[PDB]
Structures are given as structure tokens and as C-alpha cells.
Scaffold this active site. Structure first.
Site, PDB file in Angstrom:
ATOM      1  N   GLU B 123       0.537  -0.815   0.087  1.00 54.96           N
ATOM      2  CA  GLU B 123      -0.238   0.105   0.097  1.00 54.96           C
ATOM      3  C   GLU B 123       1.213   1.173   0.017  1.00 54.96           C
ATOM      4  O   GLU B 123       0.413   2.304  -0.727  1.00 54.96           O
ATOM      5  CB  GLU B 123      -0.636  -0.340   1.224  1.00 54.96           C
ATOM      6  CG  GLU B 123      -1.918   1.130   1.141  1.00 54.96           C
ATOM      7  CD  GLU B 123      -2.855   1.250   2.080  1.00 54.96           C
ATOM      8  OE1 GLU B 123      -2.896   1.246   3.528  1.00 54.96           O
ATOM      9  OE2 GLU B 123      -4.250   0.652   1.944  1.00 54.96           O
ATOM     10  N   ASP B 132      -5.717  11.003  -0.943  1.00 57.85           N
ATOM     11  CA  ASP B 132      -5.326  10.239  -1.578  1.00 57.85           C
ATOM     12  C   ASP B 132      -5.854   9.785  -2.929  1.00 57.85           C
ATOM     13  O   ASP B 132      -7.157  11.233  -3.166  1.00 57.85           O
ATOM     14  CB  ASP B 132      -5.706   8.285  -0.935  1.00 57.85           C
ATOM     15  CG  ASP B 132      -7.475   9.228  -0.370  1.00 57.85           C
ATOM     16  OD1 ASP B 132      -8.108   8.997  -0.753  1.00 57.85           O
ATOM     17  OD2 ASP B 132      -7.394   9.332   1.086  1.00 57.85           O
TER      18      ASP B 132
END
Lengths: 428, 428
Positions: B123, B132
Site C-alpha cells: 500500500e 489519496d
């Protein structure tokens, strides 16, 4: 930040105390070793009852604790108080454990404090400031407050030792608070004395109190002078020691107090006192625990104490309903109390004498214990009233009941501590 | 009131854990069962440690804890910090047990610092407050801070459960702590979910981390959509489940992250991340601890450990003093590292290969385990650096180190948990 002391006690319980429960032929290791500890974590009240008892047992080879025996005991009751409001909806097994643990705890701590009772009889208890034979302000049991000639100076100290304005008046519970500090102080002195330390260590609890006594009456160095009688005591020549003290100046100065002390030395018991000692309190403490036992009677095979109590020990069916006349079938055992016979009436003293009889008939040295634990809580209302009321009759039996206990304790193979506090026998 | 949670843990240690400690050979049921509990009541720093360790072991059966495992861990160290301040006094046996306990605890929670590493590679990590590419904002690994489309809502939110004002930036450890939170938060969701739980329980620890890894990426319900594969994993059909999982939209959306997670389920190892997750944390946790296992020697004869440590573990000996020339006598016993032999005083893997050799030569799995615990501490600076820089030589000898535990826990009759962290060999 953790209770290293609570954890120690618990550890002490899982380690050294439970084998003494099982050894007493009270239940098996299955339950006292594995079951109770498990339960403890779920039920706070049992945990407290358990720590108090542990503290009690640990503190016979470790100082400090004491207060834990008292606080936990308190909490166990705080929580047991509200657990019992709805018994049938609680964990009957946990309740049974708690009660049993508390009973044994009360037994071990029975004699704790008759030293205070001892000196009370021997010296006298004064609740308000007065002056000793030298003019000094004293209070409680010969407790010196100050050599200052100011009554109010006394007051200050009295209020310092306690924690409030007493105006020179305290409550019995404060007298002993004070008395006990004085015993502590006396003890340090004995130990810091070459001529006394050996003999003291040599002595058990009962006989230690009798020495303290002397140290309270004649003073430390004073006692250190009975070197012949102190040796006999050390070597445990009880009978010898008693005769030697009976012919000392001390004896003539005060025969009655000397005799009581001598006997305590001679017999190792509180015999010389108990009669003048206020009603034995432990009886009431056991009564407040066992009552729990009688209030859960009986439960399903679901609870694992089902087969342990064995059944309802309350049942006196075989001696209640008679046939003709109002005279019962109870015969006297241990005379010099046969006086109360033949219980020829279904009137006062019955239920109690019927239980004392089943306590005498119970030869299963395991159910006998439970009958001992249960007794105080089976005493009927009437009788109970009479017992507190001072009814000299009803005190008579409680002494024969106390006699059975000593008998058992003595005759038993593996001596049982905890009933040590209530029968002496230490250990064998 | 009480602290039953603690008492449960300590009791757990006195009945469930210590026997696992003897099963290895750190042994002496007289130390871990008897000596340590006692020593524990004195020296709080040993208790926490002990409590933490025990909290860990219980965790493989009880789903709570975690904090009661972190809280104590931080405490054990926090206190052991001030402890070594005064080694040359008090008792060191407590310090000694503490280390032994801490090291063992680390080894067991090695799969936790690893999962941080797995999702690091997959990740990604970022010590800031970026937005994000999913609309909202985040922090560290993948901790959603502000859903709000605003660049300011997070710049006024992040710092909340961090202590010091993080402001915007955070340290590694600050992310780890919050990562492990989200991890556990996620394990709770999994167990709450009836589709996944049946599989999750079935899975070992490595594979449990693969399943979690999926969860993080595509949500709880997303993973549940794999039904066929899940069951397979639940039936230990590794190979098949891997093939089947390949055929999927997830494999294509993100292929690399998929291969790694696939082969992870396939083999139940960390082979896919081998060369990306280097600083196997515990190596440094242990370092600051296992150190005092070498510092305390020689132990006074009074120490209950006088025979358990015995020799100077940090002692290389003669290996560094070759008869002629600079090439040491060390000889290759692995193979994945034969490329580094003959070693030679030059370095830079000399010291490490030397210690690694005593480990390998160590028969009598008693001092073997000790050298294992102690290895991380003996690792020299210049080597340590090579490692965290990704040297293939360094990393390889480490794998050779782990190959040694793997081949050990395996060959041993009674398998030892807490080693399941490094090379598996579980569960019985």
C-alpha cells in the site's frame, strides 16, 4: 501501577492455602484448586473473600498484610450484600464458596483481639481522660497521654492519636486502636531485650499475650527478672513454670491477676478469661456467612457444590414431631450441662440442643466441619435473642459447642490451622 | 476495586505460560514457575514484562487484550530503562529474567512488525497528510483522516490520538501504532462478518495477513466476493486457491500486489516480500534488552541463573586468532552463503559468521536457545548498517540465521510457539 499485593495474595491462595482447605476434608482439590480461582475472576465478591482469607493465612509468616484481611473482608460483604438481594438469580456456586471462605477466615481470626479483652479484665477500660497513680493523664487501658500537667495538652495528644475532637472521650473501638499500638510498642521492646526475646519467640500466641501482660503490669526490665520461670517457659515446662511464679512477690501483690496469667501460661488457653470475656464475636461473623449457605439450600446437580454440602444440614425432622408427652429423645453428652435436660419440653433451647446433638453424631469428619460452620446460622431467633440478652443458660451450651470443636481439633489426624484461632491446639 | 484483568494474566502465566518456557530449555521449572513469580512481586518492571508476555500467549485464544499487551510492554521497558541504571546492586536475576521474558515476547510478536512491512511494500507509507487518489485524505499507511473534499479539513484534524501535536508529520513508530490499530479494527470487522470468519479462523498467521491485506485494499465485503477461493483456503487447497484467485478482476486492477498476496496464501511464507521488508523490528527491540544477558556475566554464584547463562555468550574465541595469515578457520555449513567463505579477518561478516557458527555448532539446545536470544545483540554496527541498506550478503546470513531456527523448532519433538514468528513450524 498494579496491586502487587493483591496478586501476591491470590498467588498465595493458588499456591499454599487451598491444600489446607482440602486437607480439612472440606471439598476436593478439583474445586478448591481449579474451580474457585476461575470463578474469582468472574465474581468480584468471591475474589475479595478469597484475598482476605489468603492475607489472613499469609500473615502468620509475614507482617504488614493485616489491613488486607480487613478491607477485602469489607468489600466481600459490600458486594455480597447486594448479591444476596436476588439470590436465585446469582451464581449460587460462587456464593457458597465466598461464604465457606469467610467462615474459615472468621475462625482463624477468632482469638485475634482477646488480648485487648485480656487486659480489659485485668486492668480496666476507661473511656474518658483520668489520672494514673502518679497524676498523669491517661485513657483507655492505662494509656499515657502526656506527663504535661495540662488537661488540654492531654486533649491535643488524644486528638492527635485519634483524628478528631474527642474532648477527652473515646469509643471502645478507639481504646483498642490505642491499646494495640501499645502492644506493638511493648513487643518491639521484648524483642530488643536479650533476656526476653528468646522466651517470647519460643511462645505461641496465647502464651505470648500472657507475657505481654506481665510486661504491662511490672514493666519490661521487671519481667526480665523472672529468669527461672522464663527458662521453664522457653523449654516448655508449663506445669513447672506455673508453680514457680505462684511463689513470687508478684503473686502476693495481685493473686487473682497472677492466677489468670499463670493458668494462661500453664494451659495455653484463654480459660482463665473467656467467662469474663464479652460474648465471643466470631460466632456472629460466622453467622453472617453461613446464613448465605442456609439461603441457597439446596441447588441442582448443576452447581458443583451439590454433592459437597451433601444435602440440607438444616433438617431436624427426626427429633421434631414426637409421639406422647412433650419430652424429646435427646440424651445428654458431656455432662456438667446435663443440667439442661432432659430438654423435657418443646420450649426454649430445643433447636440448638438438637443441632449440637447432630454435631456430636456427625462422625464423618467432613460433614462435621460443615455442621460447625453452619451452627451459628442455624440458631433460631428466640435462642439467639437469649444468647445476646446474656441468658446465662444459653451461654452454657455455646461453651459445650466450643468444647466439641476443641475435641475434634485435637483428636484429628492432620491438624487444621484456622480453627487454631478458635481452639488453640497449635499445631498438634 | 480489583484489577481482575491483571490477575487473570498473572494466573495465566503461572499455569499456562511457564510450562512453554521449560518446554524449550530456557528451562528450570524452578525458575519460571517458582522463582520468577516471587521475584515479580518485588520489582514492578519484571511483572509488567511477565504480564505482557502472558497477555500475548493468551491472545492466541482470547480476542481482547492488545492494549493490555502494549501498555505493559511500554511499562516493562520504561521501568527496565531505569533498572539497568543500577545493575551493580539489588538483584540482577530479575533484570535477567526480564530480558529473557522480553526477548521471548518480541519473537512471538514478530509477525506483527512484519504485517506492517507487508503493507508497506504493497500500500505504501507516507508520514504526511496527503489526499489519496480516492477522493478523501489520509496519513501514514492508509489511515483515512478527512473524507471532506477540503485540503484544510485534514489540516485541522490529523493530530487527535497521537499525544504530541503531530501537526502534519509523524515518525515510523507513530504510524506503526496507528497501523496496528487499523489492523485490529479490521480483524474485528472480519470476525463480525460470518462469510469471512470461517476462513479467517482456519488460517495460520501468515495467511491471515494475506486475507487482511486484501481487506485493506478492497474492503470487507469486497473480499467476501471470492467465495470459491475462500472455501478452498479453508480446506487448505493452497495451490488451487492460488490459481483460482488469479482469474479475477483484482489480479488485473493490480497484478504485482496480487502475485505477492497469492503466493503468500500458496506457501504460507513471506517469500514474496523477502527483499523489501528488512529491519525485522524485534532484532532491535531485542537488541535493547538481550544486551543485559551478556553484560551481567559473570554472574555471582548467588544468582539462581549462575548455571543458566554459564559461559560468556559474546565470546568469540580463537576464530579471530588464526594460526597464520588472515583467513579464519570458519567453514561453511549452509550453502546459500558458501559464497562468503572462507571468511577472513578482513570482515565485514566475520563477527556475525563467527557468532552464527557457535550457534550452528551448539548442540545441547539449552545454550542454543540462549545464543538465539542473544544473537541480535551480538550483531556488530558495521554489519547492522550493511543489513538495513539491503546488502545481499548481510540479508543472506540473516536468512541463514532464520534457517537455523526453522530447522530447529521443526526437528525438536515438542514444538515451541513464540518462535512461530520467525520461520514458522506450527502449531503442534
Amino acid at each position: 501501577n498494579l496491586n502487587l499485593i493483591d496478586m501476591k495474595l491470590f498467588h498465595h491462595y493458588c499456591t499454599k492455602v487451598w491444600p489446607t482447605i482440602t486437607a480439612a476434608k472440606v471439598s476436593g482439590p478439583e474445586i478448591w484448586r481449579d474451580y474457585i480461582p476461575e470463578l474469582a475472576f468472574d465474581y468480584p465478591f468471591l475474589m475479595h473473600a478469597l484475598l482476605a482469607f489468603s492475607a489472613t493465612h499469609l500473615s502468620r509468616t509475614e507482617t504488614g498484610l493485616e489491613q488486607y484481611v480487613s478491607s477485602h473482608r469489607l468489600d466481600a460483604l459490600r458486594l455480597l450484600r447486594e448479591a444476596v438481594l436476588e439470590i436465585s438469580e446469582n451464581n449460587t456456586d460462587a456464593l457458597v464458596a465466598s461464604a465457606l471462605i469467610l467462615i474459615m477466615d472468621s475462625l482463624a481470626n477468632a482469638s485475634v483481639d482477646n488480648i485487648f479483652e485480656m487486659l480489659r479484665i485485668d486492668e480496666g477500660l476507661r473511656l474518658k481522660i483520668y489520672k494514673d497513680t502518679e497524676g498523669y493523664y491517661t485513657i483507655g487501658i492505662g494509656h499515657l497521654l502526656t506527663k504535661s500537667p495540662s488537661l488540654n495538652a492531654a486533649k491535643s495528644e488524644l486528638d492527635k492519636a485519634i483524628g478528631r475532637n474527642t474532648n477527652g472521650v473515646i469509643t471502645k473501638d478507639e481504646a483498642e486502636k490505642l491499646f494495640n499500638q501499645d502492644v506493638d510498642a511493648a513487643v518491639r521492646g521484648i524483642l530488643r531485650n536479650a533476656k526476653l526475646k528468646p522466651v517470647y519467640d519460643s511462645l505461641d500466641a496465647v502464651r505470648r499475650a500472657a507475657l505481654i501482660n506481665m510486661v504491662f503490669q511490672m514493666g519490661e526490665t521487671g519481667v526480665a527478672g523472672f529468669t527461672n520461670s522464663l527458662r521453664m517457659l522457653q523449654q516448655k515446662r508449663w506445669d513447672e513454670a506455673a508453680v514457680n511464679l505462684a511463689k513470687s512477690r508478684w503473686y502476693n501483690q495481685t493473686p487473682n491477676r497472677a492466677k489468670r496469667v499463670i493458668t494462661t501460661f500453664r494451659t495455653g488457653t484463654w480459660d482463665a478469661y473467656v467467662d469474663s470475656m464479652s460474648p465471643s464475636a466470631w460466632i456472629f461473623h460466622v453467622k453472617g456467612a453461613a446464613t448465605i449457605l442456609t439461603a441457597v439450600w439446596p441447588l441442582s446437580e448443576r452447581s458443583k457444590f451439590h454433592n459437597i454440602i451433601s444435602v440440607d444440614l438444616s433438617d431436624l425432622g427426626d427429633v421434631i414431631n414426637p409421639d406422647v408427652g412433650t419430652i424429646t429423645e435427646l440424651v445428654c453428652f458431656d455432662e456438667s450441662i446435663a443440667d439442661l435436660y432432659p430438654v423435657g419440653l418443646d420450649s426454649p433451647y430445643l433447636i440448638t440442643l438438637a443441632y449440637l446433638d447432630k454435631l456430636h453424631r456427625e462422625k464423618n469428619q467432613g460433614d462435621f466441619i460443615l455442621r460447625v460452620f453452619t451452627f451459628p446460622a442455624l440458631l433460631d431467633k428466640t435462642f439467639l435473642a437469649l444468647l445476646m440478652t446474656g441468658d446465662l443458660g444459653a451461654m452454657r451450651i455455646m461453651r459445650s459447642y466450643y468444647k466439641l470443636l476443641r475435641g475434634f481439633a485435637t483428636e484429628v489426624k492432620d491438624k487444621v490451622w484456622f480453627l487454631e484461632g478458635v481452639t488453640q491446639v497449635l499445631p498438634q
